[model samples]
Target: GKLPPGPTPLPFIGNYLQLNTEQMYNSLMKISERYGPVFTIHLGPRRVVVLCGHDAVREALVDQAEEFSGRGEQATFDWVFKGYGVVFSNGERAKQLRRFSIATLRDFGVGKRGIEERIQEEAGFLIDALRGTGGANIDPTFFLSRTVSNVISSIVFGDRFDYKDKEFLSLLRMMLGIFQFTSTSTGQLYEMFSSVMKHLPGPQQQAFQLLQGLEDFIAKKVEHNQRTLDPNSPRDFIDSFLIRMQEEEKNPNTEFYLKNLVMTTLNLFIGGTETVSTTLRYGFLLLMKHPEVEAKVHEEIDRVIGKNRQPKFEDRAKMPYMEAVIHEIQRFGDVIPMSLARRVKKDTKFRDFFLPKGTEVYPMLGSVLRDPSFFSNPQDFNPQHFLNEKGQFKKSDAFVPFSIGKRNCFGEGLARMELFLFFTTVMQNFRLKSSQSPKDIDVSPKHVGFATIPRNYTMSFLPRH
Candidate 1:
């Protein structure tokens, strides 16, 4: 098959020596400058077609949605998932799992009033937790994660875990470890040489152990759900899946089974926890970096929701500045920058290049989010990118943090609600402050990983009163 033009690969190592797997997207973007947006790269003999810029990524993922809907292989994740779960699986398996998951999520009150209440409640809990710090400088990672994880936990496991719960804390840290590990230099090597890396003593082994522990936690939760499950009255995601599993038990090829249940729950749990929490962490940091932006958001929150009342999802509509800020946070945050790769579903020609069926593709979401054509000043942290001349929150077609098309994030609706409510609630309650001056603060990430993790900084959630 004819492939796109790209850099030549060395024998055995392929492009491993030339590219920076630690900052994979940055390396691909650099290559795109010379080879153009659609080009090929071999990662230890695995040929991957990288899509960059707004047009190239949009065309493949949106215009040619069907052909690019398949999930690509990431050996680091694939070793554990083995193509059983929604996030890693392709074709029919992915189709079934995604379908079941979206429906179950909706039923469990995601995108509905029930979920909003859960978030608002969690916001109250978070405020109290931060208050416990008494305006002292503290890391927000665990607190933000605990709050976000509980939202998904309530839906998936039928209850939320106390922040101090030992089991909950252990599992949460393990999940965090798995995510942070995936985007590291070590993590990228494992992806390229997983077979070799798997046997070697390193962080990959620890990562896998963490994954196994989380899986065991999920398995136990599923078992507990089984014992008390009422088919006629499914309580939560696990029960609904258990009922479906029994219904499809007679069918030989049904995807609803024990393995999928565990892995898919793991997918939801991890996916639910990491993205929003990391984005919030970045959001807080960005606020600390640009107090002007934070001040405006504070003004909007005060005028719209007031300091005394609880912030609601409905409150987002009248608060265009807040809306613009949230949108900017997502756009600028660039969480999930690599955006979980996609594969070509069928042998087809794309933009004059032949992508064989099963060929891996990286959409390079960071490129699209930072595309200059979409944002006038893509480098700057400006909310005006999402604001209109009339000061309204105008949506940009390039605003695709949840991505676009058939394989977009299933939790987009829920995530948006969480971001709006959580950010507003925090801004309404307190002002974010740092020891360093705004100019001195760096909003840049510590390093490129599976997520663009903000460099660690301690901040005080000073009570606004």
Candidate 2:
């Protein structure tokens, strides 16, 4: 079998030393440059393949999805996910659970008013909370995080918690901690040596305990839903899953079980919350830096959507510049920078290289999103990437902020709605400018966990009269 050419590996380490965390994408890009797109590296004891560049990624994600169906569940993920959720699960169970989640999300008004109303309601609370700051400089991250998570909470549990709810806030922080912990060097070490690390007390251990608490909380919610589930009227995802479980009880082979339900709910809660909120936080920071762009967005809002009426999902069609700004914001601040790890499910040949079954594959989505082959100016914050000759909004095939394929983000629709509504509505009411000089609006993100989020920046929102 022909192997993808790559730099020579050291005897035992086998390229492990090259796994630089400071600039992971750059590290992979260097490997790709040396190996010509597809390369192999040994991550600890595991042999993994990486597909870089637009062609390599397209061939793997689109042309060879079947062979790449397996998710690369790292040691840390195995400990946390326990192979129950769709993100980590494989085979029949994964297929069934994913399908069920998509169907249930649609049924629960994913693309409709039911979900929009929830988002609008949360946005209103967010606006009110921001107003309480009285134009004083405040970090919008925590508030935005809660408001964003509440949208998912409303969908999953059929309720939203008030800002002062201690338990709800604690759960949100715990989840964020888990996200941060999993992206640290210590977490990677724990994954590599769990048994040895388990004996020591550290932040990773604390994060594990918090994860357990989150799982226990989910289990309690599931039990509560089980006791009060009404087949005639399903309230939310929990109700829908409970009803499905009862119906599938006759078939013992059905993958619909209590554990899957809990883990699936956790997946939605984490995925839905982190990605969208982080994007907005960065979006606002970018707007603060580029007042000209912010002015253009405000003008578009003024012309397309006047004040007094809130911006709705349908309004996205009429507001071309607003839509362009949204797309560009996502492009400029591509928060889930690294693609989720995937594995080769079977032996596959691509670009004349043979990738055997069970070989780990990193799709390198961050590289794809910022690839020069696709975008004319990949580094600049230019909305023209989504605008055409006519200046109308046009989506490019390479604009994949949510990643793609069979394991594409399940909450993509809902996230799009939330981002549009929250971003546009805020712009419609107030202009977001940095409290400090434009030079002070730092575009460089503070590397926290897997997400590349903007540093603590304050934006002054002036009411448009």
Candidate 3:
């Protein structure tokens, strides 16, 4: 009964009167400023505890890991996810799917050297695409999205799409639409009042339609995998999952089934595409804003990897400045600021407050990412935040862009490898050139919601000598 203190929520609207639904992070941070770290706020009729700043987030997510690991309600997508896949499911379903997915990802060489060659090859294709622009001004949205999507595509579908393929491009666009819709006010309203919003006519309806489109795309791929199944050797995640379903066909309670296969494949496909690509897109803009940082990255790539060869994941070891820049990009980018909601697994005493089992929590990642105690200049874009006086890459405890604890982003290893190789290879091949001066280019996020989107700008990929 003793939930953390918070603003007195109104009867029906709850905290909406005090909150900025468009930019929920800003409003939540403001509320935290008024009422200490651990506090409650209602979104419509739901009461949730928000753990703010690095300390509170760490204390709950890390020290009290088990209790905070439950996946909270994300009603926006839960209508489709429906407690079926790894990302949305809770209890045994979540555990089983998460375990199988991790194992299957490894079987497909996710964190291994096999995946490295795939990404390096994709980076080469991306460089070719940029070269095709012939130093003309181009927006990198589709280029980066298609390239990153193909990496996971290779692992999931056992193949990658040509950049010019219409069907592939359409699917990517659909995925982008789903992410964009999630951050809109309609999306927020759906989560706050899904039962009611489900019947209402709005963008939330269209968002679900977009999700259905993605599911259809994944289902088609799964069907093809079923037809071409080779139990002797699984080709990709789909093939691996199909083989498992057959083995567990006798077990009525098996998590390895058609729905799990299709939904889990969707999970990997969506997770792999947006987050990394957005970071790269935002990183390029940040580089454009700070040419000195770009210049340093270029020098490191040239010296460490050299012009004779392609950049490798191993090359990151010798390139500290490049590493620092990528971390800072994620830090300053603050992508996925409102990390997916988490719930308490059981009645728990957290700090001084009591949270009953099933209490929803928003461990505000934006707060942790910008905590003043961790970052001296929390708001600025500074690679030095990840660099020491000795000019080497340094790690910060608050670098939780992927969120923390058991629910942390599972694709972090793949994302890191992609970020380093893609950034280095591109820097090696071209210099980012914008018509506007560095100071004029805004590095601040264009929208702050489910994701932090960079402002749209066109730049020339001027070939390096």
Candidate 4:
């Protein structure tokens, strides 16, 4: 009973009925104001410690890094991944896989020149796709997700798909469904009470069914790679993973095998696609609402990138204001208000409370990213948060869109590069705005489960030239 104070739990419901399940972000925001940034809340029978605001988030995530670093499980992804991949797995297997994943992703072009070249190449395709739309109303969900997925495909599958490829487009749609599902109340319910939901009928069954389809897609790719695998001549992640699997064949305990490759590839594919695409989509909506912000981005892109040139990764450092804009967009237009669950490895001393071993932790990222004291204008869509007195890009510790510490996103660097290159490339070419009136553009999430996903809307890409 040494947990941080929160609403009292009921017999089976706990504190579920007290808050809007769809608006957990706002609910936690209210709770933290009363509970002083560090409090405990119950979801059904499970107790979760909420770390709110920049100070509390940093203290737990950075100050007491190791104690708050264990990967916590939920029923949501248990059926989908079953603790086999990097995102959900903990312990020695998780450690080995993380190291392997980090190394292998690098080998397959994460931060290196190869990935940049791929992203740059994909930007051209993205521009062409928009151009063909002829400045008409276009829902950017699939369009943006497709391009983002292409970047990951180059690394994971060794090749990018054409925009017109139906099967590949089908695969992208299913992936998008998983992202949408996670942001639904039914998805949240399944995560909390998966034991009962797994056996009962519900909307989540559709999501779980899609999970199997995605697995089968990866499974086929993995099977094909295994057949024609040549260690000396590796093509992509699957080839590289297969080579490692062979190296660890003698050890039955090796985590670098087929199932991991499938699941981890699925992780890379989904992780790479969903958050970045949603951020760009939301960022665009913000830009549409604030034409001044859109104009400034255009001006920065023109000054640094120019009209006739493609934006490269190196351009990110040169364009401080644009960098600030993207940073603020990510900060206020947070995709994931909170990250996947993490737990205490031992009976840890967190703040003024004695958090017991295996105490589930929610490092409420939105609270930190939108902390009023640190951000000054926490809820507003403004770039000044990341800009210094000199107008140069200034980084903030409060920006925790990807969370922090040892368990932060494994693909953070890669994700940043993609956002920069893609956003600049598109903005440099088009004056993108809402198809509807600017006054009507809304950037809030349609659903807010684990991810703060944006509502679908149309954009008109008016060619700058």
Candidate 5:
């Protein structure tokens, strides 16, 4: 079959010449304008087929699922995660881990009172930290990420940390550095040429070293938990997995070993922490950009929740516009522009093209969320995308921040609850204002690895009257 239309590729180099990690999204958007939704391009020797627009994405990702398994291990991810966690694993192990994670998350009270209480506790800590700022300009990213990560830590380790603790801050900084290294141009090149690059000096080497240190930290924690855990009563994810390991010791084929336990802990820390905090950071920036929307959100919260009462997860149903705003924020912000990489599991037909097994397919999540055909004024920051004619919150199939199909995000329910609870909790007590004029809260994201995060900016958090 003929390749999908794209920019002319030079032999041997392919799209590698034009593809720099920092500008990859802009480059893809430029190509999509010329080539329509589905296009194939090459980065070095790897064949990457991108499915743009909602229809094309849905057809390939949801309509024909078996063809697209998770992407093969990229050198960068393999170096960092070693393909041990749910995000990167494939085949039987992936299925087992995915099912177990969903079940475990439910047991931990995702989408229910248990998880909500954890988020509420963390949110309180975050609000108290902001109160210390005394309406002064603050980055908010560091504290926000720490607060979110602690929720995961609480679920996994059965404890929370003080916001100002040095160990907690160090862990957050290490994770941030890993994110920075992975999001850079050098990072992509390292992934593409890991064999040659591994021996050389670069940021990837540092990132790998940091990741190893993190793994060691998690391993130490696991060991401590194992030594002290009660067999009759498993406390957190670590305790729960420890019990499983003991119970399954008789099975010779059990792959859920201690290494996997460590990797899973790291996976939750990296995945759960970065994504939600980044989105909330952008949510505030967007609100600053559109004060009317911010005012409306505050109005809704105040009317439904009142001034003294802190917003809770159960209160989401009472506040329609606030709910719509959160949906619109995720939609418009488009934090994870590209879906996690998926590899063709078997020979499959996508649209009129046949994707042979082992071909790499990427669902362009940013494009789908903003597809003009599905969303009216797709480029605008309008909360009405999720609102019906009567101003009630309405759900759209295309509003897929957590992704969809067989390998959708394992922490979907937990992430959703966190976003809602944390977002509402923040908005309930404080008004986020940009340090500069509203014009300066740039909506244009600086590309950081696979994520589209807001540019570094400061904002003031005034207590709500």
Candidate 6:
């Protein structure tokens, strides 16, 4: 006989005007404090029960996983992907594709020893490019994007592009644009009204146009892969998927078809580029502002991981502070603020609250990380948040950058390895400094929407001499 209570929202606009969409996660955090952890608020016309704090989120996502496992249909992702791939859809198609994606990623050496070499090699390429800068201030955005994209590109496309490759850079630029635009206040509105917004003229259409070009580009790659596919020797993700599709082609209802393959490839491509790269960008921004934290990183790397040998994933165990710092980086970054939206498969009883079938649930991930129970002074960039009295590392249920439950990030293992490797590798090789004083360099993001993207800032990277 109970549903979680929240601020009464007006019809049509529901809570949209009261809570600023620009800083939606922060706003949700505030509301939850008033309504308690498990509470409902309206996002537009829809009644959205937001799960805030660690305990409520865990109960819904972890304890009662199946009931809350379904991915709520997104207007933008559904329309853009046409509900074919794993990301934008749920049910059997999403289930099959999700399993296939995990298996495929593993086969291609994600979370395996083979993927380490790819990252090490790419890190060297990045270092060389930064070396070429002669310690002059440069925007780390494209440099980080290219390096990180190519790391996953090797696994997905069977090869990596040169740092200066114009075509690859163009695609990456388009990818970045889509990410920024989609995370805007305007962009959030589009996801709600994408049906109407699609026909209307604006930035969403512009982003869609670029997305089409990217899709076409992927389609051409698939075309080439189809003609030259060798079943006996699988080249990469494209080849691996192509082989599966061909084997299952006789069945008309086979989910392994061209469109699924293309959309799935796009899923991997987009996922591969955006998340880790943004984390790196945000991590560096944090490092730039917090010189003491930055100094500890440099000192720790120098002591544990000498400048001579390349850093490895195993090295993370020996360096507790490094581990804590990276965890704090992800927590502080709060990359996926709301995570992916989820829908109830059926009417569910959740922790003294009743959610009707099809209620849109926003698992406020930013709030989870910022919950005062786990993190002391959640706003600060303190590595100590993950440390104990012994100065050893600690883990928190609230430290869920990749999120929790069945719908959590599929690439969580790989992303963590990459973060450890990339964060340590960069600190190992370079002594990063900004032109602006640490006081002047703003760490808080300029854009605070779907993702908190760091403002474009320039810094000089000096190779440790």
Candidate 2: tens digits of C-alpha lDDT, residues 1-465: 777766667765566577665455667788777777788876555667777767778788888878887787656556767888877788888899999999998888898998998888888988888778767777787788899988988889988878999988888787667666665666655543565666788977788788788888888888888788788898888999889898998898999888889888888887888788788988888888887888889888888878868778899999888888889888878776666778777888877889888878777777777888778879998888788899899877777778777777777899999999999877776766577888866687655335565676666676665
> For candidate 5, lDDT tens digit of each residue in 1-465?
655666677775678766776666667777888788888877666778888888888887788776676556566657756778777777877887777777887788777788888888888888888898889998988978888888888888888878778877877877767766666777766655677788899788888887787787888889999889899987888888788888879887775777778888888877888788788888888989999898998888888888787777778888889889999999988877777778889877777777777877778888889887778999999999999999999988889888778887878778888888888888888898788888666787765556776778888999876
State each model's CA lDDT, in order: 0.87, 0.79, 0.88, 0.84, 0.80, 0.84
RMSD of 1: 1.2
- Which tens-of-lDDT digit does each residue in 1-465 have in candidate 4? 377998888877778876667778888888877777888888777788988888988888889999988887656666878888777778787888889889988988789997899889899899898999989988988889899999998888898988889988888888778878877888777666776778888778888888898889999988998888889989998888889888999998889877788888888888888889888888888888888888888888788778977888888898998888889889877888888789898899776788998888988898888888878978888998889898888888888888998789988889999899888988888897677888777777798878888888887899885
| Candidate 3 segments whose C-alpha is farther than 4 A from its true place | none
In lDDT terms, which candidate is top? 3
TM-score for each candidate, following the candidate numbering: 0.98, 0.94, 0.98, 0.97, 0.94, 0.96
Clashes of 5: 3
Q: After superposition, how far is residue 296 of candidate 4 from its true place, in Å?
A: 1.4
How many clashes in each structure? 1, 0, 0, 0, 3, 0
Model 5 TM-score on a 0 to 1 scale: 0.94
lDDT of 3 by residue, 305-383 (tens): 8888998888888989999999999999998887999999999999879999999999899899999999998999989
- How good is model 2 by TM-score? 0.94
* Candidate 1 structure quality by residue, lDDT tens digits, 86-132: 99987788999999999999998988998999999999999999999
Query: Which residues of candidate 4, in runs, are more than 4 Å off?
Result: none
